[PDB]
Amino acid sequence: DGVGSSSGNWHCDSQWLGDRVITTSTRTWALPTYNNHLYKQISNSTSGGSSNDNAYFGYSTPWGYFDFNRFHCHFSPRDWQRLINNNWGFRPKRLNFKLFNIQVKEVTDNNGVKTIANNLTSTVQVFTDSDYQLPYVLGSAHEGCLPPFPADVFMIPQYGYLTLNDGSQAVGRSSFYCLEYFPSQMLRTGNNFQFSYEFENVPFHSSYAHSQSLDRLMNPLIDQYLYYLSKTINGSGQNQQTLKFSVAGPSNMAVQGRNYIPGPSYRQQRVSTTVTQNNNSEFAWPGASSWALNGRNSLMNPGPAMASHKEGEDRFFPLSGSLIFGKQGTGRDNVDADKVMITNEEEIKTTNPVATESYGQVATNHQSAQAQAQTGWVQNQGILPGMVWQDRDVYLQGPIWAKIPHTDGNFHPSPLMGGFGMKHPPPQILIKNTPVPADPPTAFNKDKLNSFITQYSTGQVSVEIEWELQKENSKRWNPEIQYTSNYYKSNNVEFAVNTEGVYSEPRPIGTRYLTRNL
Amino acid sequence: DGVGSSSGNWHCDSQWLGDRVITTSTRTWALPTYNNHLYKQISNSTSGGSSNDNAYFGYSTPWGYFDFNRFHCHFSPRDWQRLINNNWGFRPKRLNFKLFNIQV
Amino acid sequence: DGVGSSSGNWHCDSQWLGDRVITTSTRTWALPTYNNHLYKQISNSTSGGSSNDNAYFGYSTPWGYFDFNRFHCHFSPRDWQRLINNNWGFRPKRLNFKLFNIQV
Amino acid sequence: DGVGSSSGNWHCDSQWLGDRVITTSTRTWALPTYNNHLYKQISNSTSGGSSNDNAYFGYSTPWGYFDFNRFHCHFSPRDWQRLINNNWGFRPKRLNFKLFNIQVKEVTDNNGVKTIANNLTSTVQVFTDSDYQLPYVLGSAHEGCLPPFPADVFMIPQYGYLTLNDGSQAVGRSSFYCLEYFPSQMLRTGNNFQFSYEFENVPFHSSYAHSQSLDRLMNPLIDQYLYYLSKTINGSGQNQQTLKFSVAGPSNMAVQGRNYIPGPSYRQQRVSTTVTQNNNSEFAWPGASSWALNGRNSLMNPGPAMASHKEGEDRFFPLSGSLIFGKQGTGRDNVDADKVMITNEEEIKTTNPVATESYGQVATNHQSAQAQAQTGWVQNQGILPGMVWQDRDVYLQGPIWAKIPHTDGNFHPSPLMGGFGMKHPPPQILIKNTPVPADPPTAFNKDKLNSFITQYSTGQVSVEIEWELQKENSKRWNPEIQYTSNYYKSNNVEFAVNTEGVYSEPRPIGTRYLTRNL
Numbered sequence A, D: 001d002g003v004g005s006s007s008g009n010w011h012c013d014s015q016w017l018g019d020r021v022i023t024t025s026t027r028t029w030a031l032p033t034y035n036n037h038l039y040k041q042i043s044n045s046t047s048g049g050s051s052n053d054n055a056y057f058g059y060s061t062p063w064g065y066f067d068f069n070r071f072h073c074h075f076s077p078r079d080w081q082r083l084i085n086n087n088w089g090f091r092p093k094r095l096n097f098k099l100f101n102i103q104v105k106e107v108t109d110n111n112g113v114k115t116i117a118n119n120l121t122s123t124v125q126v127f128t129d130s131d132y133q134l135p136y137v138l139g140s141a142h143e144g145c146l147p148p149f150p151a152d153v154f155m156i157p158q159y160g161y162l163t164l165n166d167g168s169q170a171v172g173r174s175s176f177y178c179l180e181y182f183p184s185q186m187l188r189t190g191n192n193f194q195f196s197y198e199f200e201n202v203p204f205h206s207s208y209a210h211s212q213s214l215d216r217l218m219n220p221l222i223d224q225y226l227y228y229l230s231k232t233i234n235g236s237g238q239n240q241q242t243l244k245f246s247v248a249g250p251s252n253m254a255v256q257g258r259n260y261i262p263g264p265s266y267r268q269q270r271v272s273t274t275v276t277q278n279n280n281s282e283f284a285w286p287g288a289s290s291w292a293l294n295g296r297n298s299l300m301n302p303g304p305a306m307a308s309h310k311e312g313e314d315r316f317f318p319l320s321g322s323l324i325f326g327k328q329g330t331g332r333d334n335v336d337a338d339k340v341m342i343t344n345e346e347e348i349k350t351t352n353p354v355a356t357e358s359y360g361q362v363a364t365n366h367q368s369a370q371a372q373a374q375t376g377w378v379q380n381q382g383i384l385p386g387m388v389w390q391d392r393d394v395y396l397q398g399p400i401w402a403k404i405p406h407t408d409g410n411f412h413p414s415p416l417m418g419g420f421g422m423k424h425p426p427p428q429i430l431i432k433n434t435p436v437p438a439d440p441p442t443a444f445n446k447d448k449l450n451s452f453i454t455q456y457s458t459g460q461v462s463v464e465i466e467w468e469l470q471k472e473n474s475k476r477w478n479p480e481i482q483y484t485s486n487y488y489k490s491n492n493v494e495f496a497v498n499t500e501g502v503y504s505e506p507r508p509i510g511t512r513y514l515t516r517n518l
Numbered sequence B, C: 001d002g003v004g005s006s007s008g009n010w011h012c013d014s015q016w017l018g019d020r021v022i023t024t025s026t027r028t029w030a031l032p033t034y035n036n037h038l039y040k041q042i043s044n045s046t047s048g049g050s051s052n053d054n055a056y057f058g059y060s061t062p063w064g065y066f067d068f069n070r071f072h073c074h075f076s077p078r079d080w081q082r083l084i085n086n087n088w089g090f091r092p093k094r095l096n097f098k099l100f101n102i103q104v
């Protein structure tokens, strides 16, 4: 429209209908010029990397992008409480995105003194990758999200991507992408941008914990009509061999026949937060579970979903097998345990093997009169028919969706870090300040212009997501576990601003409070 | 229109139909003042040329001009590969040119 | 029809439409009598096999069968190049089979 | 249809309408199996060739093809006389082709004794290359035409083709063609084949000779108003220099201004049929005009059209510059002049330079008081604006059409051997006996079958061509030259059968008898 008109309004609320929740978030952003308007080849060579496991090849772009892919972008802590205490499930449905009130600014420096002024004719350009033709970086859990607290102003992160490498080198199959080779909308102050998106059908996240365990599903009062082998010897001494059979029943539940078995396992090393209980060695990398791809070792960072500890063992956690969030102000490198927050998957204990335990035991031989029966431990167990499992829980600090990789086959493509896997996730939204040349020379020169006006932009972003709810139908008589604030006096309010103005999230909050039968 | 409105959008893609290819290229340009707004007689004398084979007479203008007359203006290397591997022939048909978002 | 009429024509080409390829292959075959018109029990015993991993039991028939189940049956090397350089994917859709000009 | 019915009738006549001639020719053919049903790589290595100028790479095919591309296929000698004496021009219009009364036969040999029997269920397969997707060999002047005499039974020639080579080797750009990869019609006895073809617009062949020469086009009674430089010196002695100018007129015709000049020239070496007049050396190849392509030398066999000798010099002929036909029964290699027939282009003497002469003279310097005027001979002259020329004459023994090569550019693409150049000439008609296996073994073997029943086919071919005529409009008072038979007694009739049954063509017959003004 024009210089003097606002191109959009602040809309931050949430709206609870019967089976639907509509979250709306507005934030203020700032976009720098990245890479001096250049595309740059980057690799572990350009960054000085060494180990082959860390080698990479790729490109950094002048562009930047929006990430709303964490839940605290869309939910206040109160809204999150309201979701998790009342609902068995939820999934995203629709998306609405807006860019408005764009302001492009010019920075001039004289001597040690900078002046900022509006550049009214400068433009910002924006496009969504709707055909998913770019490397999709939103499914890796990155910084640069919209801030959880609506009054914070955030920097837009720089877009970059990786392609195939051999060491620091690239192969011929490596692909380079110019983001200028897409059509994009150009925006002066007074222009706005919007688009809508439909989430594809995704199952409801399970926001409940089971009130039954998979090995306890029997009627405790009644025998089975099945028999098991109770006794193989008639007693001490030579040549005592029998087959004795007993009814499996209430008194021996471990031996009863069952129709369903716990889900798959890939075993994690167990680490105690009580520190003297740990070995006196460096096992962090060496003792870690990992998978290998093309000679590279990638740590298996989230487990396949697994229970983080056994009952009462809460001090234990799987080495890499859980999500670790930092507290507010926690540094980058080598921080103590009290400065991070270790998620635990304890609720899926009912259907899922413990991350730090063997799946079970198998027979390793044929017994005989000569040979005793031998068993061995199953350290990793793939899918078996009859397995049943829960996915990893999702968190207010955590990711929402991932892009399912485009491949011939996948199994149960729920993202291992948690959330909703999608073949066509919310598309990437790319934004860039268009370069404005400084004064060119008065004689022609064929070289590309390397001299530009120093410039940055700011504005507002609205994200509106419609969420579908699955209500609790339970007949449970006794009251349930719910997420609560604690009444006891404290210097600060949890999930509130500091005395210095710093918003913090004191604890990770999962979704699983309400219960269901198994 | 106005100071605060963009007068055009960035369109750079290529579009492959059955017997047609449509290339679109968007670039950012800068235009200096040339010749201090003057027309100037120029010759090999003004440039110091000597040999008769190189002698010339003409004019330089304050104006400047657009040249999209090379193929890499319209074709990405991948698009060029896609053209040359699959086709016995090609020719240009239509042209559309735009100037927009002018900033003085 | 009759002794003096051809019951079919040779059709070997390939046809590239926009999203479809139609391959057609014609070959000349010869069919012997197998097993002297007999069904025969066969096993690794009848062939002299030994190891249990190789043991088998079955039947050989007087019949014979057609196998077009390799790609070079339907694609010339040039057609294969044309498929693999230009396309992210392909799948079979329809099939048409003919036997004609039989000569006993 | 059936075994007992004829699938077509013999139609050999010609039909003269007002401006149209329709020729119809029927012949009997025999088709062997070629290459034992195999495609074979062939090269100068496989044939033992040596010189790089003769090196080639290609394939021979089991297929064979029809060639009606000579005029004696469609015209009796009387019809040819009737064409050339009455018409200024003619061109082909339509084509109709038929294969019918196919007979496939089986050959069995016992000991030194062969038995031929019908194989009623065997088939012949036929297709036209209508999209011109095969190497086109009909535009090279080859044996294997339909015989000029309708009672002769002819063998179908074997189809083969060449692709790119380096020496005897092939490069990656070389292309291989399987003729089985085309659709073709299969024919038992009782099946027939036909197709129609439209000639594209081609200019009329010029069946006239000019009654004027390009340098005589002036009015002999009247002066020009132009002047020429008659005299550059005033006389003998020193310092005699003048410019004298005269009117060009009837008495000096060589110097008059003219609007049009003779056509282009590429000079041929002159050879006398009076043999003692020739040099005593081997000049056949060494003294020959040639063009070079990729390091190979190809003799320039037909000239660009040029006059074969000057007036009264008929004993002279251009080395390669004319078409040479063999007489009946003339051998393959090193035959005397009396056993061949040397065509002469003498009629185009009016507009075309003599093949064995220089085109003319050009100035090679600047004359001056110090330097005399110098000229040099033009041995080859390309097209100049204002040039005018006739194409090579066409012959009853000669070719009709050629395929214009498919290229970015060509100039005046009249075939140099004569006839009608066409971008889409009459298509190639390919024919093959379909292989019939002998008895296969009773155990399966994956090898292709190399054992076949010995087999060949015969039948009839009809070719019908409609020809458009251009009548003579001339106002010439005196009678003209016409082609005639000579009345004088001879042992044989010309263009008739021998006492042994051998048809022969005693002389080459061109088209140019009638005259036109220039």
Ligand SMILES: OC[C@H]1O[C@@H](O)[C@H](O)[C@@H](O)[C@H]1O
Residues within 6 Å of the ligand: A051, A053, A285, A286
């Ligand atoms: O390969 C050895 C290294 O492996 C890395 O992945 C690990 O983070 C480092 O601590 C080091 O142990």
Ligand SMILES: OC[C@H]1O[C@@H](O)[C@H](O)[C@@H](O)[C@H]1O
Residues within 6 Å of the ligand: D051, D053, D285, D286
């Ligand atoms: O290169 C020398 C040879 O060239 C051939 O083209 C010619 O026919 C031979 O006679 C021989 O002279």
